């Protein structure tokens with residue numbers, strides 16, 4: 001046991017499958033979004049209580065907490081808008097239209113220093129997700145676009161974004177299965193390589209930032225050498241219920257969810273990784289036998305888990321696991 005489990009609670013205010021659930025930067029609030037466009041904002045320490053609740057008139061695809069103003073939440077729509085929501089004042093500060101032909105705001109990342117954010121904006125899905133997309137850099141102080149990064153070889157939908165600790169690097173994964181790493185000082189692509197057969201769903205810097213981790217449609221979790229483009233450090237086939245597609249089957253009726261939120265999350269120092277499964281969160285130790293072996297199973301879910309988070313605050317771990325029945329389990333972990 002590398003962790004003791006201090007409790008497992010259920011947040012149940014959503015009645016639809018969860019799309020995203022993320023802990024804020026203070027580590028004390030959750031923002032969660034379901035497929036019916038219900039945004040909920042809630043605390044959990046010492047009990048679960050709801051701070052805000054709103055139906056979006058518009059489809060909502062993405063969610064990102066601000067880094068340097070804890071109470072601000074960025075929301076990306078399916079109608080080409082970025083909304084800035086004040087969780088404390090329970091009102092929208094602004095909603096900016098993206099003056100373009102790319103309505104799907106698939107991914108939002110706020111810079112660590114708080115002066116900037118990035119969003120991906122994609123064309124409509126085809127009657128694949130292998131469609132044109134853009135990557136936009138914004139100024140948080142004006143909430144205006146500054147520039148778009150050209151994507152080679154072609155405009156492509158970007159599914160996932162993450163900054164490094166300082167914010168000078170941004171790693172992205174796209175629907176063409178390619179990872180693109182951007183130098184955010186020079187505003188150019190430092191590095192790119194083919195990462196997955198099919199889509200990249202999540203990307204993350206290792207704690208030490210010598211590697212980035214990725215998970216994608218081919219079912220593989222891969223660790224890449226940030227110093228040498230496309231050189232793998234290690235590669236594992238996760239169980240299929242880590243990357244879906246996620247099915248809840250009734251009389252010939254089923255609900256199907258393709259990955260959209262973050263499929264993996266890490267402890268404070270990046271030694272352990274939480275993933276999805278039919279029946280709850282599954283945690284692995286990083287670092288490297290041939291078959292990656294599971295050290296902890298959080299359980300507690302009676303419908304597929306589709307997205308997860310992991311935050312550490314007051315020296316305690318909080319794991320979120322969110323399933324297709326709309327339930328969010330909040331498990332509390334102590335690192336011995």
Ligand SMILES: N#Cc1cccc2c1CC[C@H]2NC(=O)c1ccc(Nc2ncnc3ccccc23)cc1
Pocket residue numbers: 066067068069072084093094110113114115117140141142143
């Ligand atoms: N860390 C972080 C971080 C992340 C995202 C955001 C922000 C931060 C820190 C600063 C904060 N920005 C703001 O609070 C804000 C709020 C509104 C405005 N702009 C407008 N407000 C009203 N009407 C407008 C109409 C047309 C255009 C613009 C408008 C600018 C900044």
